[PDB]
Amino acid sequence: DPMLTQTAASVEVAVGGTVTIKCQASQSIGGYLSWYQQKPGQRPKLLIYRASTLASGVPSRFKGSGSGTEYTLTFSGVECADAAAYYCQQGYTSSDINNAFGGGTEVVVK
Amino acid sequence: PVPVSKVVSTDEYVARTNIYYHAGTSRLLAVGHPYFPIKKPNNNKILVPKVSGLQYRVFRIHLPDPNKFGFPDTSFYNPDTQRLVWACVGVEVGRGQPLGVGISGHPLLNKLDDTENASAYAANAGVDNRECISMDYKQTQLCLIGCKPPIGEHWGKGSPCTNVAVNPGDCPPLELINTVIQDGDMVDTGFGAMDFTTLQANKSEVPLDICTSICKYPDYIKMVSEPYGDSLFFYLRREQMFVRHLFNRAGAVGENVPDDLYIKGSGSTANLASSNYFPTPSGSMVTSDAQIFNKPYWLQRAQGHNNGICWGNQLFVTVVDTTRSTNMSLCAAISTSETTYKNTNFKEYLRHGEEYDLQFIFQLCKITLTADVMTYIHSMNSTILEDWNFGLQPPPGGTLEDTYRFVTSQAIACQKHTPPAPKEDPLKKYTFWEVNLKEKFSADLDQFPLGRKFLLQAGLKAKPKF
Amino acid sequence: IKKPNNNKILVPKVSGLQYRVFRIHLPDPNKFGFPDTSFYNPDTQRLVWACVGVEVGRGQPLGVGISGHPLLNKLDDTENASAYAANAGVDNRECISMDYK
Amino acid sequence: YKNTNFKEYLRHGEEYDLQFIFQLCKITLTADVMTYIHSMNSTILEDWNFGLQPPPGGTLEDTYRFVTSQAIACQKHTPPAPKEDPLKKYTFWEVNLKEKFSADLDQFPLGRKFLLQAGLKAKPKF
Amino acid sequence: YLPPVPVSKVVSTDEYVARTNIYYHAGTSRLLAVGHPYFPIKKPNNNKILVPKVSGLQYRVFRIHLPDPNKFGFPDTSFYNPDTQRLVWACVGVEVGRGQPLGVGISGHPLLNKLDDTENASAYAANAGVDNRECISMDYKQTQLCLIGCKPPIGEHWGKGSPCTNVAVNPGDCPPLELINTVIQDGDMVDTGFGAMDFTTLQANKSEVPLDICTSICKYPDYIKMVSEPYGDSLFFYLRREQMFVRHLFNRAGAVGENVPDDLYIKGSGSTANLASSNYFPTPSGSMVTSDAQIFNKPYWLQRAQGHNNGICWGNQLFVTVVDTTRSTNMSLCAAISTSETTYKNTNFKEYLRHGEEYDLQFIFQLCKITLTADVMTYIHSMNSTILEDWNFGLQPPPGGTLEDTYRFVTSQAIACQKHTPPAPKEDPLKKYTFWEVNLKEKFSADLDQFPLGRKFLLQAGLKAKPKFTLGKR
Known about the structure:
- The structure is cut from a larger assembly and holds 1 copy of chain A and 4 copies of chain B.
- Chain A has strands at 18-24, 33-38, 45-49, 53-54, 70-76, 85-90.
- Chain A is mainly β.
- Chain A has a 4-stranded antiparallel beta sheet, with no helix packed on it. Chain A has a two-stranded antiparallel sheet with strand order 1-5.
- In chain A, strand 2 and strand 3 (45-49) form a beta hairpin.
- The PDB classes it as immune system/viral protein.
């Protein structure tokens, strides 16, 4: 069972700060990993997959890195509509796992 | 004093007598499974062996040395300063099974879809998209005669470079490796001469007869350019292969295609299928017109410097045949008492037959031994004079004293009996088919099927009886 | 094969379809020792090589390659069509492989 | 078996071998031949010199000049190379044979096929 | 089969090398060297050499790679069987040249250990300031030499070794100072002034001599080791020359360990109950460096070596070393950070120092063939193994194979690591000891009339029908 923990509550950040959210995995998953932003009133919404390739309609000010077992997600220039919930998620599609790919939050930006 | 630093063909230091000899084995058979060996579920012991049409077939010919011959005529040579050696003039590879072909496959091949006529775009993969496909192989026939074993090449994996860091998932590295052909090596099947053990990680690329073994193509330009010409006297070849089906690879592409190669698609064609393809080979019709075997081969001059001389009293014959590879398909019932046909009443098996003949003619050749010639044979292969009795160096010895008589009990120098075990020859780490031609010689040519074909090549009928 | 940052190529493109043009550099015969003749005069003579026999050799086993495109312009078949064709929208390119002559 | 477990690649091997047989020829350069070769290609008469009674000319300095420390003075590779290759815009396979020559035609696997065709044999050692 | 007895004594080369009438000329083009005269400058962070040390006190050993004459082209009537005899080069004339003005080359470093002078005084003061050392500069001594050998030359110095474990009382003790001799590099310096002691592994204060010899070894050639060896190798034409003079008389710091005896002086009283100094370093000065005795640009030849072998160059190699300190100019360079100020200043122009040197070599080589019939073959292999090993007299190994696959694209991810990763010798053993390479593979010329040394050799010997009567007077 590959497990991503994400036991990290996010720190208060101002406009223009940089945040390092770190998602670590027990088993090696390759590069297959996704990230999502969850605004607390609507459906979830994806930013980047395979830790390097961003989706359409998303600005290039979000970053992606990390390989092997640990991965990250950084960005700078925090707007007003970045108050949401974040989630890292693997794609190893195994059978005997109980993933839920959980963890991740983000404070209201001052 | 005047040692030469050239290579001399053996027509200058070997004489040719008049005395011919005929040999021949009986016939060679082998029976077993064509795909994989069958062993018991617990030990390593094989219940049946694996014999197929595609595997190589190397015979070594154990000869008896002619200096041990007691000739009634003691005038044509002198055992003071001469040695005797065999020379092959006629070679025959006879086979007797009927012609035809044989197919193979895999229960789980790993093809995504056909690509030759696609009606629409392909769907996504999912997990476990294996299939069961079988096909026929390329057609190959060869025959090489040599004093030393055949030298083939195959692609394989070497060590990557230590400056840059590697990760799990990189492309394996590649290099050429020259090896020695044994019996049981597979021929190339049209999937190229590459190892599939260390380079096919998913173990489901090719059909299973070559899935966990090296296939080797014989290296020609290495063997001809070898000095002394001992690797081959001559060879023969006829190969043909054409492509039948065109499938798509299933699995993650390593490097994506660069974006300047294609205008970017959208809609359902936003993404790409797997770019790489692999073909399906097919051999065309066999015939009795394009055969190689069942006809003799008289050699006049070999291509190398060795004009057919058997040093060490051995020679190596290889042959690969795929025009006789039909696998018979038996089945046996557990109970014939039933009225109806139920498909759980029968077990199925596969068996493959194979049949051979070898027939030779050897000529008797002698060597005058001058000290100038003695260093030349000392230089090309030093084990020849050790296998004769000519290599001389005397140790005098100190006449060492024997131990106490009691020996077994209360001896002071106890355990003085200690065995050395140096009794070893080279070439014994490799295993392959041997024959025993020690007791099959004859001097009467007219009592044999090849021997009448030899005299018609050169006349000299000798049979007055009336 | 190239990394998308730089222009230095990672893996070169070698295929069994392209040409191969070799440059043979013969060394100049005005500096070589030829065994036994008083044949060459440096005033009124010069030396040059001629070609007599060539043997080019290949050593890989025989086999037919294969290639295609993930995206190729192909509307339908024309070898045998039963009903009339459908209209073509946008992005009507499929994956077709083939073999060359 | 997982379809996401394995990356796939393609490679392609290649093999070649070139063998040749050359024989040298000598050209008597009288007054008439030098009119012929200069009409054919003028830069053949600059491999061998023949055209210039000083190979310098009057205007030549020291023939070469080498400032060797490798890195402090005016630079060594920044002067443009005058002896240009007239095909150097075209890139192709580079093969050097300036030392692989030999004289014994008995040793090499083409060489005794050449002595098949024209016949003959080398002088015997024994 | 039972080779004959080899002669127990060595022999000159007149008995077993031949001499023909075929001569060749080989002259290198021009050789320049620019850098700093005191220390090789480097980055403050790590090791990287921007300018090399170049000063006119080095050794400048040359290494001449000769073309192999076993595949080389000749005019007519020069023939040999390659199975019986082989060929070798021999030098008969050599020149070393320089075009420069005529300099001095002084030096001195700002932390030189001087206390006082001991030439005149009025009252000596016992002073002992903590590091009271002061900048004093000085001159050097002029030397010249030329050595020509088949192998590199050999120098010496006086250093330090391990003493016997008998007594160990103090870290402030004295070394044994044994004599060792090494092979000479390109960059080792000479001074016939202070002499041959390495000032690093012997002197820990490193403030004894100026700084151009302070991080390195000041060597000196032997002239005994290179003539007593039984072959006549490594030098066969030497020309020594130097001058010297003494200028001033000084004192070291004065922390004397080897104390004065009591029964040498008489004790006084007051200020006269101490010791002034006992250690005196004098300064050298080369004087009157007049350019009529300069042993340069003069084409001397050879008819006789001092050793047993003549200028036969085994291994197609040759070594030349020249030492000069008469062209020791110094170039006071300076450049300005800003030119607009119409008054000159302290720090508007900052200055540098450079030094340069120009060489030119020209040789005359002579062909030499050596026949080999079973007797010299035993002798040559016993002279040096590599001389017989550079020519193949053994036939082929049983696998020869196509020598090296030679992959085309050498840097990729397709192939494995290649290109001489395990380096089995076949190289020069002296690769670990640097030289100055001079490549002369295709410098040779069969005619030598239109060459600047070639007529000087031709005029000396007979020139009768050799030049030829190209287009005539009438």
